[PDB]
């Protein structure tokens, strides 16, 4: 319908809530009619494992007050570094960059020039069974 045109690209996972309605004269005029559809609808895109947006997570004032209480410290980079190895021993300086890639850096596109790339790309190498697939 009107305010609901084009909320989805083809290839996502979306919940649809509406009414299952069958219209049309089912072949009794003059081999099967009664084709069906669903109208009166609301559209809700939902997060996949590997597709689409997951940024619908809310933030309360109770939430951000904890963040503002958190950011007033001096060593939280260490705690966030040690946090991301829940079941993996070691690899301290590796985890530090994994914070920073999700930060993504800053982007400043030049005036009538070109963009300057801001993100960070990392390859690792090591012997097998050493938390590479972990």
């Amino acid at each position: 319908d009107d305010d609901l045109v084009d909320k989805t690209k083809p290839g996502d996972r979306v919940n649809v809530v509406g009414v299952f309605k069958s219209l049309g004269a089912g072949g009794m005029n003059q081999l099967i009619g009664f084709k069906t559809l669903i109208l009166g609808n609301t559209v809700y895109p939902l997060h996949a494992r590997s597709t689409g947006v997951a940024a619908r997570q809310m933030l309360t004032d109770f939430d951000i007050r904890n963040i503002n209480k958190l950011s007033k410290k001096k060593d939280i980079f260490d705690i966030l570094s040690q946090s991301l190895a829940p079941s993996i021993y070691g690899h301290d300086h590796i985890k530090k960059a994994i914070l920073l890639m999700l930060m993504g850096g800053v982007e400043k596109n030049l005036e009538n020039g070109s963009h300057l790339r801001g993100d960070i790309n990392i390859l690792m190498v090591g012997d097998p069974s050493t938390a590479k697939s972990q």
Binding site: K9, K108, L110, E111, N112, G113, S114, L116
Partner: protein, 687 residues
């Protein structure tokens, strides 16, 4: 049944006030558009251009001097389709008609409308004679003649056309009014509520069709009653009509039998194309759509494919639905009608005005040290490589040619290759060159195959043509090419076929064409594994044969020697990039590209001619080159052979070097600059 609605929009006094504005305008000798209409009456022009600003200037003018004007900007802005002919019939009220005796060679269209003007009046002169001869102030006597005679309609004999023009924000900046028609809007921003409005879109011209005439009205000769029947068609298809529809063939036993005619019908120029989205305001996970735009009349043959253009027009549906079973009952398929073209990146070889041009060009000329200022200005966002930028400035020139006549041409094209890896950031310049330069297509290695960048054959839509590729597109322009080392080997063969000019041979399944291409080539390949081994030779760290290197007149090398003193300026260079958004400081001001290309395009129309003293200087200088090149004959740091094509380039170069003097003054210092860029381009591998 079928009620009625009143609305504040009037048709009566708007027609009255639009007559006055069409007459009373003096600001921009006598009246503006009547002198234009006299120029239309001079029978030498086909278009009528109407702004919105002089309207708004008049609408400012009437309120400040008189009581009240009806609003007319937002009046046209709403519906905009009824304002075509209701405005244009007021034009035919006032006309300096006999303003020039007709030329015998003027127009075959002109001799027909002169008849229908005269045949109207001679038929008008007959009926007023009979009525006064049968009597029982003369305005009613005139009025009886008005309704008792079939005539030609005034819509049938027009000969001119009218295009509207949107208002800029500039006068709207002074007085804010309904400036909603002129915003850079997207196809995604086209909601289905903007139908009938006047809009402004932009994008990329893609899949341009061909121009073919569109039939509008058809004449029909009676051959018995001697009338002419006229049928107006606004549908997609139509039908021929019956045996006759006269008033005199009517009420009679034997009706006629008709047939149409060609020379008496009215046609129209017709061609359409599609516009792809600008690919900058697209959301983060979307694919760009397209849109159909019909073009009619004068504005045809003005839109090359693959450009950046501002299209303004009015938004109308077309009666069409998709599949038969999928029809929900009222499905409206839309389009846009073109009204005005404003192109970004104004194309060269299309201007002749010089006065307001040299209002800024002479200030560039009188700035002093212009030639060194230019290569500083093209893509200044890297550090160093000034001589490298200087040769690319000369690549932007090109622009020389000669045919001996009943013979061969010579191509005035420059083909500079780039070698080196990787921290020089060559692709920063590769995107920059095809960006400023008009007709610039950025290409990669594998993303076009051997059939991609050349033409292809597909089934034509509504209007079996040869659909071309990027090099077919980027003719009379510069192609930016990445990773020539990883092309197909058949794709290499086409590139050798461009080094002889205009040649693209095809021997496929049904195609034998040899199409033409005025293209220009920039290439940049990377060296071998490792980086700069002096134990390795030239052509040892190169993955291409030297016959291809013989086709390259100019070659560079991108060294990277880590030197202690070169870093600190470059470190201050790159850190200043993120401190601001502009590099130079207190010593230089950059040239904006729009003013830059106009000085280029004016320099493209010079054609300097050589002299005899410069003939003497080059010959023995080529004996300098021919002698010392053929004393090594080795696979050492020096390259093997010296072609006569080297002399073919350097004569062409100093010819192109003379073009930036704009003076036809081929001199000794003209050639003195040309020899310096040869010896430094080669053999920079010494450090």
């Amino acid at each position: 049944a079928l009620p009625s609605i009143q609305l504040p929009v009037d048709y009566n006094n708007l027609f009255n006030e639009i007559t006055d504005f069409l007459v009373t305008f003096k600001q921009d000798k006598g009246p503006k558009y009547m002198a234009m209409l006299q120029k239309v009456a001079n029978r030498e022009l086909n278009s009528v251009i109407i702004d919105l600003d002089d309207i708004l200037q008049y609408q400012n003018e009437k309120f400040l001097q008189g009581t009240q004007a009806d609003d007319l900007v937002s009046a046209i802005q709403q519906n905009a389709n009824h304002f075509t002919e209701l405005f244009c019939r007021a034009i035919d009220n006032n006309m300096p008609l006999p303003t020039k005796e007709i030329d015998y060679k003027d127009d075959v269209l002109d001799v027909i409308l002169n008849q229908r003007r005269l045949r109207n009046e001679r038929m008008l002169s007959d009926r007023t004679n009979e009525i006064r001869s049968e009597n029982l102030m003369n305005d009613a006597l005139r009025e009886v003649v008005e309704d008792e005679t079939e005539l030609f309609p005034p819509n049938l004999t027009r000969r001119y056309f009218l295009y509207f023009k949107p208002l800029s924000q500039n006068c709207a900046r002074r007085y804010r009014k309904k400036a909603i028609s002129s915003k850079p809007l997207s196809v995604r921003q086209i909601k289905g509520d903007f139908l009938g409005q006047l809009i402004t879109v932009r994008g990329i011209i893609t899949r341009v069709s061909d121009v073919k005439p569109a039939v509008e009205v058809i004449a029909y000769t009676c051959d018995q009653c001697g009338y002419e029947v006229f049928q107006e068609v606004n549908s997609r298809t139509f039908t021929p009509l019956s045996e006759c529809t006269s008033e005199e063939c009517s009420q009679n036993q034997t009706k006629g039998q008709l047939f149409m005619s060609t020379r008496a019908s009215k046609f129209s120029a017709f061609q359409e194309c599609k516009i792809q989205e600008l690919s900058q305001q697209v959301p983060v996970g979307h694919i760009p759509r397209s849109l159909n735009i019909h073009v009619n009349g004068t504005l045809v043959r003005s839109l090359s494919p693959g450009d950046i253009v501002d299209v303004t027009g009015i938004f109308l549906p077309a009666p069409y639905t998709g599949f038969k079973a999928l029809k929900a009952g009222l499905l409206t398929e839309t389009y846009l009608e073109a009204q005005f073209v404003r192109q970004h990146k104004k194309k060269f070889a299309s201007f002749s005005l010089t006065s307001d041009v040299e209002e800024r060009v002479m200030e560039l000329i009188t700035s002093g040290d212009v030639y060194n200022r230019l290569a500083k200005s093209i893509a200044p966002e890297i550090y160093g490589n000034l001589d490298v930028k200087k040769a690319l400035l000369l690549l932007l020139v090109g622009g020389v040619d000669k045919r001996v006549g009943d013979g061969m041409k010579i191509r005035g094209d420059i083909n500079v290759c780039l070698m080196g890896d990787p921290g020089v950031a060559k692709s920063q310049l590769l995107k920059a060159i095809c960006k400023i330069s008009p007709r610039g297509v950025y290409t990669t290695g594998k993303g076009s195959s051997g059939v991609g960048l050349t033409a292809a054959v597909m089934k034509d839509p509504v209007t079996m043509i040869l659909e071309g590729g990027a090099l077919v597109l980027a003719d009379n322009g510069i192609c930016c090419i990445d990773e020539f080392d990883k092309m197909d080997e058949s794709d290499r063969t086409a590139i050798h076929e461009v080094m002889e000019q205009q040649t693209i041979s095809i021997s496929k399944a049904g195609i034998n064409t040899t199409l033409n291409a005025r293209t220009s080539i920039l290439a940049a390949a990377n060296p071998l594994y490792g980086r700069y081994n002096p134990r390795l030779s030239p052509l040892d760290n190169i993955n291409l044969p030297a016959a291809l290197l013989s086709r390259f007149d100019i070659l560079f090398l991108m060294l990277d020697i880590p030197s202690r003193d070169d870093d600190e300026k470059l470190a201050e260079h790159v850190t200043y990039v993120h401190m601001h958004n502009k590099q130079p400081d207190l010593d230089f001001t950059p040239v904006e590209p729009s003013k830059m290309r106009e000085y280029i395009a004016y320099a493209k129309t010079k054609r300097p001619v050589m002299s005899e003293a410069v003939n003497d200087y080059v010959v023995q200088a080529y004996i300098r080159l021919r002698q010392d090149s053929k004393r090594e004959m080795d696979s050492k740091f020096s390259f093997g052979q010296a072609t006569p094509r080297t002399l073919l380039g350097i004569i062409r170069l100093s010819q192109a070097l003379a073009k930036l003097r704009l003076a036809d003054m081929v001199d000794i210092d003209d050639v003195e600059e040309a020899l310096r860029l040869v010896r430094v381009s080669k053999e920079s591998l010494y450090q």
